[PDB]
Amino acid sequence: QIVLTQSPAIMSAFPGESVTMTCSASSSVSYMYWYQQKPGSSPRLLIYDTSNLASGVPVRFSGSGSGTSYSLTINRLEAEDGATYYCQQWTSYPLTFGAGTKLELKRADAAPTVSIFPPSSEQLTSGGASVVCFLNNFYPKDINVKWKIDGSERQNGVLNSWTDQDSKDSTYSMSSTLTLTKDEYERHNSYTCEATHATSPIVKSFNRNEC
Amino acid sequence: QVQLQQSGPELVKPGASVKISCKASGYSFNFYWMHWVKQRPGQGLEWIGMIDPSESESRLNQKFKDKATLTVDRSSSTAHMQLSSPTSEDSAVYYCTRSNYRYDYFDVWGAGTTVTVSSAKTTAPSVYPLAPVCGGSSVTLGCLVKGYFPEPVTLTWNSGSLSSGVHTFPAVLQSDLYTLSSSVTVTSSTWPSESITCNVAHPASSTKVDKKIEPRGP
Ligand SMILES: [Cl-]
Numbered sequence: 001q002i003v004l005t006q007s008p009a010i011m012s013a014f015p016g017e018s019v020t021m022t023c024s025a026s027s028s029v030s031y032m033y034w035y036q037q038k039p040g041s042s043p044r045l046l047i048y049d050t051s052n053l054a055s056g057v058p059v060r061f062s063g064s065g066s067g068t069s070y071s072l073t074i075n076r077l078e079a080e081d082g083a084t085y086y087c088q089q090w091t092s093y094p095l096t097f098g099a100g101t102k103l104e105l106k107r108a109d110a111a112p113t114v115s116i117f118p119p120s121s122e123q124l125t126s127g128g129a130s131v132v133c134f135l136n137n138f139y140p141k142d143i144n145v146k147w148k149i150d151g152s153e154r155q156n157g158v159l160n161s162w163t164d165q166d167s168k169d170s171t172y173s174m175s176s177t178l179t180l181t182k183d184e185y186e187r188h189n190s191y192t193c194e195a196t197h198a199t200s201p202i203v204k205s206f207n208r209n210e211c
Numbered sequence: 212q213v214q215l216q217q218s219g220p221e222l223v224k225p226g227a228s229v230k231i232s233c234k235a236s237g238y239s240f241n242f243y244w245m246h247w248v249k250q251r252p253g254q255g256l257e258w259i260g261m262i263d264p265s266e267s268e269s270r271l272n273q274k275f276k277d278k279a280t281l282t283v284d285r286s287s288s289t290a291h292m293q294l295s296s297p298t299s300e301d302s303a304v305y306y307c308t309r310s311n312y313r314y315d316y317f318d319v320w321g322a323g324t325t326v327t328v329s330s331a332k333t334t335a336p337s338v339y340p341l342a343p344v345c346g347g348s349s350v351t352l353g354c355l356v357k358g359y360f361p362e363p364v365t366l367t368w369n370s371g372s373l374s375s376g377v378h379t380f381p382a383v384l385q386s387d388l389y390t391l392s393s394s395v396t397v398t399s400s401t402w403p404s405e406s407i408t409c410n411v412a413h414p415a416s417s418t419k420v421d422k423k424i425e426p427r428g429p
């Protein structure tokens with residue numbers, strides 16, 4: 001029942017920065033182990049017996065510590081290093097991991113490329129109507145997407161999904177889907193999706209049945 | 212050539228036991244302990260327990276004492292984990308992972324088995340084309356995969372031949388059904404003269420659909 005407490009929970013840095021994350025154990029441990037988990041893959045051993053690098057782990061990674069306090073350092077972060085990092089103890093059963101530090105990357109601010117799509121004919125035959133907007137290749141992650149129907153904000157029926165940070169260009173992308181009934185879709189004219197963060201918003205719109 | 216091969220995604224209804232398998236290869240099976248690890252969103256990594264294949268000695272995390280049963284089939288170099296009376300709390304990715312002979316670490320991992328414990332019905336998606344309205348250097352098209360259960364679906368563009376400029380967004384669950392979408396961006400002169408088709412498979416419902424993205428007109 002050795003509880004491992006990792007801080008910070010979430011962090012980000014530019015490539016080139018030195019980053020350190022800590023793992024505090026509720027009672028003394030003999031060694032700390034560190035695992036790296038990139039989104040969508042299995043955890044992989046990074047550092048064992050406190051400071052020994054696993055086979056193939058580059059020299060930018062180091063581990064240190066003793067007693068109840070341990071740390072992992074990445075000296076000159078690289079874009080590929082985005083992952084969640086877990087410490088792990090093998091001093092007493094049950095074996096435990098910390099809750100992880102999710103490390104992401106910083107880059108230059110980038111505006112999204114925004115594309116809007118009306119309901120397909122196919123969907124309309126089923127009696128439903130979804131309007132979709134893609135906000136692609138932007139930074140930072142925390143963008144606001146706002147839907148308007150005939151110029152009134154619509155918040156109900158909006159489903160958003162972000163991609164994991166891109167491991168090559170450090171951008172995010174998101175898809176926003178507004179679902180209405182066909183009946184409701186057919187009684188309004190303009191559909192707009194608006195992307196804002198800090199200043200001018202990016203606005204894409206269409207008018208139903210105006211071809 | 213050290214590997215751990217895990218079984219595919221499982222859907223089970225609450226109360227119905229689930230068994231997942233982990234086939235080892237490229238090493239001498241009896242010499243190494245096999246561990247199991249549970250991963251749920253927001254809940255990091257939890258160690259379930261371990262088993263010695265040599266004589267099937269096992270040790271479990273007390274948290275899972277009445278939940279998980281670990282066995283091995285020495286003849287087929289396969290470890291199994293069985294979960295009794297599952298609830299939605301048992302939905303997770305489960306990894307098997309081998310411990311190093313000399314050191315206290317996990318040195319090879321399987322790819323994980325995703326277990327969904329749900330009473331929701333297996334449902335086929337509807338796949339809808341996303342083309343821009345009537346009428347830049349590029350054009351973005353898309354594909355909306357709406358209303359399936361359980362995960363996963365697989366989505367490709369032009370059978371896998373269009374792989375760059377793609378964003379396929381993680382599914383989102385709403386009222387027992389998932390919805391996913393994908394975007395593809397090409398040079399503005401590429402489409403519609405070159406066809407672009409979304410290929411979607413949902414193995415659970417034996418659904419395989421190709422949807423050509425057609426331009427919108429009057
Ligand atoms: Cl079913």
Ligand SMILES: [Cl-]
Nearest residue numbers: 357358388390
């Ligand atoms: Cl749905």
